[PDB]
Design a protein around this ligand. Structure first.
Ligand SMILES: OC[C@@H]1O[C@@H](O[C@@H]2[C@@H](O)[C@H](O[C@@H]3CO[C@@H](O[C@@H]4CO[C@@H](O)[C@H](O)[C@H]4O)[C@H](O)[C@H]3O)OC[C@H]2O[C@@H]2OC[C@@H](O)[C@H](O)[C@H]2O)[C@H](O)[C@H]1O
Length: 381
């Protein structure tokens, strides 16, 4: 078969699970309203002035590039221009470099007021910023700068591939292997950063010289994720070497294990399958990870070695983990797919100081499983 990119048909797995259409759309809208306009123990979005707003990492009391970029995608996928523009204005103003080795990249986290905490960037932010902006252009049309969406996107993806050619700086993609990097400087990666589905669409909307690269990178990332995921459990490390093996322990933590970052791999893999249907391995990977967690309660979620050895330590984001395991049902045809969809439906949004990452993964799963995580092309509106 052909994917949602070709057919324009999006699977409603909640409907397939037996839930009513009415119910599903109401549940999606409520999730938007709570995360963006809820109470002080739920909402993760905060509007600032008349033309700005941010997504708060409640857990770390800072504003991340990954989070702001997640927020923009959430906004454009839900047809929420006002909120989309507020977020982008915050990112463009406070976070985007206008000079230095990081010119056109984004400072990976800052304070709610906009004061930067580190200058270095996080590539998973950049790619999400780029994809979100192209969808904004395709859905709403380019506004006046800085709301010339497709132009802002192309400028970011130019930097991503070409940052070292203008004197000093490093590219976010390693030219030799066409793989996104953990950060510009270090020659290793993060499985969760690989969005081959997003790169297919960059191959359509990026600067003309780079379109070949993005198409090659789509297939490179699909290949990398086959080497990153354990062939039994379908678990993956947080940081990985280009060969897919867990990276050495870093100075800021041990990232060889299946923890917070790794959760998004199963969701990323599943969305690529839904959109493009290119890699039949993605179905098997969805079956494997679901089968590893088929027997495990959310309250019993741990840190695991990719081999499947549970640490005594609990998962920091078990609702997040359930959401991504549930999102895998987009691609899973196994006997656990139906189970995971119902399990997620009966799981509410997280509350308390650690809620941010859980609720971000929650909302993407709510979008995806309702059939509302869609490609916005140069169509006939
Ligand atoms: O913790 C001290 C910081 O470590 C150094 O590393 C930075 C990375 O952490 C960052 O990757 C970010 C981190 O946030 C990720 O999302 C997480 C998922 O886990 C949840 O619990 C959490 O709420 C959520 O935020 C997100 O996916 C990524 O975007 O990437 C940048 C990296 O930068 C650099 O560290 C390496 C160093 O060489 C550079 O100097 C620095 O810029 C930070 O230095 C330090 O502050």
């Amino acid at each position: 078969g052909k994917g949602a990119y070709d057919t324009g048909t999006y699977a409603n797995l909640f409907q397939r699970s037996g839930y009513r259409e009415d119910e599903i759309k109401a549940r999606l809208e409520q999730t938007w309203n709570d995360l963006f306009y809820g109470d002080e123990h739920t909402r993760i979005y905060y509007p600032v002035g008349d033309d700005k707003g941010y997504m708060l990492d409640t857990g770390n009391d800072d504003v991340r590039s990954a989070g702001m970029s997640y927020g923009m995608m959430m906004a454009v996928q839900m047809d929420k221009k006002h909120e989309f523009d507020r977020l982008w204005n915050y990112a463009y103003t406070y976070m985007q470099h206008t000079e230095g080795r990081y010119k056109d990249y984004f400072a990976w986290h800052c304070k709610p007021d906009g004061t930067r905490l580190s200058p270095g960037p996080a590539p998973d932010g950049e790619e999400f910023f780029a994809m979100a902006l192209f969808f904004a252009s395709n859905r709403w049309g380019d506004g006046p700068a800085p709301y010339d969406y497709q132009a802002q996107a192309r400028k970011i993806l130019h930097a991503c591939l070409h940052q070292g050619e203008q004197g000093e700086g490093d590219p976010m993609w390693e030219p030799s292997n066409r793989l996104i990097k953990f950060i510009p400087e270090l020659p290793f990666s993060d499985p969760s950063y690989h969005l081959p589905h997003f790169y297919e669409l960059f191959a359509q909307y990026a600067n003309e010289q780079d379109r070949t690269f993005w198409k090659e990178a789509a297939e490179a990332s699909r290949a990398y994720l086959r080497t990153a995921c354990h062939p039994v459990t379908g678990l993956s490390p947080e940081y990985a070497n280009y060969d897919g093996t867990p990276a050495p322990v870093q100075l800021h933590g041990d990232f060889r294990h299946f923890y917070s970052d790794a959760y998004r791999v199963a969701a990323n893999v599943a969305l690529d399958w839904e959109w493009f249907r290119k890699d039949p391995w993605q179905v098997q990977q969805s079956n494997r990870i679901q089968a590893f967690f088929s027997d495990i309660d959310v309250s019993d979620y741990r840190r695991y070695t990719i081999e499947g050895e549970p640490f005594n330590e609990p998962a920091l984001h078990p609702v997040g983990l359930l959401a991504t395991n549930a999102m895998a049902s987009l691609a899973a045809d196994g006997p656990d797919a139906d189970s995971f969809v119902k399990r997620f439906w009966n799981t509410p949004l997280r509350q308390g100081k650690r809620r941010y990452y859980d609720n971000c993964l929650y909302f993407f799963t709510m979008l995806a499983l309702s059939g509302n995580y869609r490609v916005y092309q140069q169509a006939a509106a």
